[PDB]
Amino acid sequence: GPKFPRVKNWELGSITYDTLCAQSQQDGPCTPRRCLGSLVLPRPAEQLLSQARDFINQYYSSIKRSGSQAHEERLQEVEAEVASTGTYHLRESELVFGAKQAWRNAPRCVGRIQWGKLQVFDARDCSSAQEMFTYICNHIKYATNRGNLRSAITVFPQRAPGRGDFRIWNSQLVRYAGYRQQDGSVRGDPANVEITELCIQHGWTPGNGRFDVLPLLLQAPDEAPELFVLPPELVLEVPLEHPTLEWFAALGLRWYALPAVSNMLLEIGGLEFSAAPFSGWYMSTEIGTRNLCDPHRYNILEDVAVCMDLDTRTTSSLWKDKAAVEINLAVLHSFQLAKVTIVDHHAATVSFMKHLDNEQKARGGCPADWAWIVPPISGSLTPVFHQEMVNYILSPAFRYQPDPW
Amino acid sequence: KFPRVKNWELGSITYDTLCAQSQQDGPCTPRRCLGSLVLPRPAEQLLSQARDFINQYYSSIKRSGSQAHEERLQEVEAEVASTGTYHLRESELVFGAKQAWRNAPRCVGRIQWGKLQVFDARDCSSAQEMFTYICNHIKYATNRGNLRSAITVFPQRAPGRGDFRIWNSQLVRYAGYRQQDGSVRGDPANVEITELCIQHGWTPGNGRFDVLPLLLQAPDEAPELFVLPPELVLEVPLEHPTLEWFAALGLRWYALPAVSNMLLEIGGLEFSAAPFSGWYMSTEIGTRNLCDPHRYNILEDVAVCMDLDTRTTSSLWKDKAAVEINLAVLHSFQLAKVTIVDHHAATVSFMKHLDNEQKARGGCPADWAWIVPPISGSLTPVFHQEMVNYILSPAFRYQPDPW
Numbered sequence: 088g089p090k091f092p093r094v095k096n097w098e099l100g101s102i103t104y105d106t107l108c109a110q111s112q113q114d115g116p117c118t119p120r121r122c123l124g125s126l127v128l129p130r131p132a133e134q135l136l137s138q139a140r141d142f143i144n145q146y147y148s149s150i151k152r153s154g155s156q157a158h159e160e161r162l163q164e165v166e167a168e169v170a171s172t173g174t175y176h177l178r179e180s181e182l183v184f185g186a187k188q189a190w191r192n193a194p195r196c197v198g199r200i201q202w203g204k205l206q207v208f209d210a211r212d213c214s215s216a217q218e219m220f221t222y223i224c225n226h227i228k229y230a231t232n233r234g235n236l237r238s239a240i241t242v243f244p245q246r247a248p249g250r251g252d253f254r255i256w257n258s259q260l261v262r263y264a265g266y267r268q269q270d271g272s273v274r275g276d277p278a279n280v281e282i283t284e285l286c287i288q289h290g291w292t293p294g295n296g297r298f299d300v301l302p303l304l305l306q307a308p309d310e311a312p313e314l315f316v317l318p319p320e321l322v323l324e325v326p327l328e329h330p331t332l333e334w335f336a337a338l339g340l341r342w343y344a345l346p347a348v349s350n351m352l353l354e355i356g357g358l359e360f361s362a363a364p365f366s367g368w369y370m371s372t373e374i375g376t377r378n379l380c381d382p383h384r385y386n387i388l389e390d391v392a393v394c395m396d397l398d399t400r401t402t403s404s405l406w407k408d409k410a411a412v413e414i415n416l417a418v419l420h421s422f423q424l425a426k427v428t429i430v431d432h433h434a435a436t437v438s439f440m441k442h443l444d445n446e447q448k449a450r451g452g453c454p455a456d457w458a459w460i461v462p463p464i465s466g467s468l469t470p471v472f473h474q475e476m477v478n479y480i481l482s483p484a485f486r487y488q489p490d491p492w
Numbered sequence: 493k494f495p496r497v498k499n500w501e502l503g504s505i506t507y508d509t510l511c512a513q514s515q516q517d518g519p520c521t522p523r524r525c526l527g528s529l530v531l532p533r534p535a536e537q538l539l540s541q542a543r544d545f546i547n548q549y550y551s552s553i554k555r556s557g558s559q560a561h562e563e564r565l566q567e568v569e570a571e572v573a574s575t576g577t578y579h580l581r582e583s584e585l586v587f588g589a590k591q592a593w594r595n596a597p598r599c600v601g602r603i604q605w606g607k608l609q610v611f612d613a614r615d616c617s618s619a620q621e622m623f624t625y626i627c628n629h630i631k632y633a634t635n636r637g638n639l640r641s642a643i644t645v646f647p648q649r650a651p652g653r654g655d656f657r658i659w660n661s662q663l664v665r666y667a668g669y670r671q672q673d674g675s676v677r678g679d680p681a682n683v684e685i686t687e688l689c690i691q692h693g694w695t696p697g698n699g700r701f702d703v704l705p706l707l708l709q710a711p712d713e714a715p716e717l718f719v720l721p722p723e724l725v726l727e728v729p730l731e732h733p734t735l736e737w738f739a740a741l742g743l744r745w746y747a748l749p750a751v752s753n754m755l756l757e758i759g760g761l762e763f764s765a766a767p768f769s770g771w772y773m774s775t776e777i778g779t780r781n782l783c784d785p786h787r788y789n790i791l792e793d794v795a796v797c798m799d800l801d802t803r804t805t806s807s808l809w810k811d812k813a814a815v816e817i818n819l820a821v822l823h824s825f826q827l828a829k830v831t832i833v834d835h836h837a838a839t840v841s842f843m844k845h846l847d848n849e850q851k852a853r854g855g856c857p858a859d860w861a862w863i864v865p866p867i868s869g870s871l872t873p874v875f876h877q878e879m880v881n882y883i884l885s886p887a888f889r890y891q892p893d894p895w
């Protein structure tokens with residue numbers, strides 16, 4: 088019957104059709120001959136105006152003034168502005184709508200039930216690296232809120248004709264250093280080897296711990312990036328303990344409270360915000376499974392398994408699975424004890440299922456990347472594993488962008 | 493543009509050039525990826541699939557271009573032009589069956605692909621004969637617990653008639669009895685096949701693990717019912733290495749996974765009944781079959797027995813119970829001397845397979861969502877490996893349910 092993707096939930100037996108995917112203006116990486124859904128990185132003039140017009144149409148739809156005189160006047164304002172300057176500028180409320188929509192549109196985010204609750208800090212007046220730092224500190228303070236975390240984004244000035252970009256060089260506001268050793272191994276977080284060395288190249292005096300907070304390397308237009316040390320009192324961390332394994336605290340593990348992504352581009356109506364850091368709170372598997380157990384990250388599975396006295400000499404003891412579960416439990420327990428917002432992967436995926444239903448009714452579908460939405464432990468124990476998903480690109484969007492260096 | 497494929501744990505990069513050999517479309521387009529969906533939405537064409545397959549075969553025996561090769565192409569061509577169809581030689585069928593397995597993107601067990609016993613049952617003319625062949629397949633593949641991969645190929649589809657079909661989705665399936673109040677006793681995945689069995693005259697039991705009879709269908713005949721001799725169905729009682737109450741749950745699973753509802757396509761020819769068997773990867777039983785909410789759904793029972801706090805997700809009671817259940821399956825299969833592979837060993841051998849296939853064919857079609865196991869995903873190397881999904885032929889395909 089319906090000429091749209093049919094989407095099945097295999098746990099419940101229920102069927103929906105995604106009609107929203109029709110509004111996709113941008114190609115993904117798949118073709119009829121081959122699916123590239125699992126790749127992490129899939130490989131203006133009148134063009135701007137059409138993205139602009141579409142965005143303005145979306146704005147006026149969301150305030151229910153679509154076709155109105157205020158709607159037609161905004162369209163004319165935008166084309167006039169582009170006509171004379173090659174670019175245009177968003178009203179404050181358009182920025183707020185666009186940032187929330189970009190989050191709503193992100194297929195890889197399992198946290199989207201929260202999308203309507205986003206504090207948008209408008210930092211489009213920023214004109215130096217020093218001021219970026221003040222804005223970032225204010226963001227961190229607001230978002231951290233002594234452990235009661237609050238979703239926020241800070242938006243620095245858009246890319247502009249000729250002029251250099253605003254960029255935060257760091258991939259997150261909080262990152263632990265990774266120091267390449269003589270033997271070729273890494274102390275700290277191997278994910279951060281390159282940013283760490285950039286920080287040293289730019290004058291930072293390196294420490295030598297497993298959990299040294301990195302400075303921020305902030306770049307204002309047409310200038311070299313500048314180095315800023317976060318005041319330690321602004322970076323809330325949680326030492327890790329386990330509810331019943333008393334030795335786990337002795338491992339001296341910790342993670343920071345605030346996940347704040349700083350290297351993504353926010354695109355709204357064809358305008359490009361190259362510095363627009365955003366933060367929410369962690370889902371517990373990000374820390375306990377990926378950051379702590381990935382082989383190319385802290386890689387602590389075997390140390391924990393040994394402390395647990397498990398048989399690490401054979402795969403069939405399920406030592407990796409047992410250790411990972413206890414590490415995840417330690418993350419959840421430690422964040423709870425410390426009163427820092429965190430969400431477990433069961434609670435998060437249940438809420439994402441609710442989000443899917445809300446969006447089916449509001450927009451006729453919801454772009455979702457199954458490989459990313461399904462948690463990295465206990466996949467089929469969560470309701471999302473059993474849910475088919477349609478992945479597609481809608482704008483406004485958060486997008487990857489090349490590293491500034 | 494051929495895809496660049498990266499492993500994120502190791503930093504290594506390959507290029508899939510095999511995908512250019514795909515003739516069949518999947519469900520994705522540039523506008524939207526449908527990769528997570530479980531199911532899909534003339535003489536010249538048969539002749540070109542047939543030639544392509546004959547070519548694959550002679551290349552496989554190093555005999556491309558030979559007189560044997562060109563004469564086989566003429567035989568196939570003469571047969572199609574005259575009759576609209578053709579027939580495979582046994583050796584071609586053997587090669588085709590192994591290649592369809594090799595090409596199966598959802599299969600994590602393909603390191604084994606070269607090791608497949610092929611039973612030719614194309615001279616089968618009745619449901620009765622199908623049963624004899626199936627019994628011999630089970631006996632062979634089971635081998636007192638030392639499992640051996642096998643396929644039995646029944647007669648191909650033919651334009652003028654109904655298909656040979658096995659109605660059951662596996663040769664071994666537990667009954668699912670729907671209650672007056674909607675709920676299910678046994679395996680809810682098998683409610684429909686169970687009702688079909690009763691309706692065709694099977695006297696049902698009333699347990700959680702009642703082995704179903706087979707419904708076997710010869711062309712344009714109602715299916716017939718055949719009870720499997722109990723000695724042919726090897727089962728494993730489930731116990732746990734350290735948790736004594738676990739055996740009290742009364743759980744078991746069967747040794748032999750033997751899928752019997754898929755269509756085998758070779759060179760344009762279609763085998764609507766070609767059941768195949770290997771051995772289980774432990775998560776299929778421990779995680780999916782026993783812990784899926786729409787299956788036996790035992791997570792709560794086990795958590796309670798383990799005295800876990802089920803009042804909150806953040807105790808990870810589900811995760812803890814699931815791990816113990818998978819451990820029980822592995823332990824119990826090991827104790828019974830029945831072949832099984834855990835999800836770490838299986839995914840490690842699949843990585844070796846990806847590397848063998850890169851060297852041999854310049855790629856390997858793989859469906860990431862199916863290859864990564866349903867617990868402990870990122871703890872296995874396959875999670876960090878990009879994969880390219882596409883359809884090569886010979887292939888195993890889904891087909892409609894015959895009722």
Ligand code: HEM
Pocket residue numbers: 186190193195196197198199201205238239240365366367368369370373430435459485
């Ligand atoms: C409210 C709490 C939130 C939770 C628990 C959450 C959860 C997550 C998780 C677990 C991921 C996967 C990250 C990874 O595996 O590397 C993710 C991806 C993402 N989320 Fe969120 N999210 C939250 C809020 C936000 C906010 C506030 C934004 C932006 C306004 C956001 C936008 C994104 C984007 C853009 C991605 C994709 C990153 C990529 O493609 O690489 N989310 N989310």
Ligand code: HEM
Pocket residue numbers: 589593596598599600601602604608641642643768769770771772773776833838862888
């Ligand atoms: C040797 C031991 C083998 C192991 C451990 C194994 C493992 C698996 C697993 C775990 C799956 C996913 C099944 C599911 O979740 O429903 C699978 C899929 C599959 N395997 Fe195997 N495999 C083996 C041998 C074979 C053999 C002998 C064949 C056929 C000749 C085969 C063909 C397939 C096919 C066609 C699928 C996909 C089914 C679908 O798309 O629904 N495998 N394999």
Ligand SMILES: N=C(Nc1cccc(CNCCc2cccc(F)c2)c1)c1cccs1
Pocket residue numbers: 127128198346347348365366367368369370373
């Ligand atoms: N809980 C969070 N997690 C999160 C959200 C978005 C992005 C990320 C970081 N993802 C990095 C993935 C990655 C890593 C290395 C290379 C690569 F291409 C991609 C993490 C939040 C961060 C900000 C708001 S919520």
Ligand SMILES: N=C(Nc1cccc(CNCCc2cccc(F)c2)c1)c1cccs1
Pocket residue numbers: 530531601749750751768769770771772773776
């Ligand atoms: N270990 C095995 N497992 C396995 C292999 C292939 C297929 C299957 C069963 N998969 C059925 C998946 C499924 C379930 C419900 C509905 C649906 F559409 C599809 C299981 C083997 C079976 C035969 C050889 S190895």
Ligand SMILES: C[C@H](O)[C@H](O)[C@H]1CNc2nc(N)[nH]c(=O)c2N1
Pocket residue numbers: 125126127458459460500875876877878879
């Ligand atoms: C190759 C594969 O796409 C890659 O490992 C993905 C899989 N799923 C993921 N899912 C999330 N949420 N985060 C990730 O980094 C990844 N990594």
Ligand SMILES: C[C@H](O)[C@H](O)[C@H]1CNc2nc(N)[nH]c(=O)c2N1
Pocket residue numbers: 097472473474475476528529530861862863
């Ligand atoms: C919707 C989703 O594709 C579906 O639940 C798939 C996911 N991955 C799977 N992987 C395997 N091996 N077997 C399955 O049945 C499934 N089910």
Ligand SMILES: [Zn+2]
Pocket residue numbers: 117121122123124520524525526527
């Ligand atoms: Zn796809």
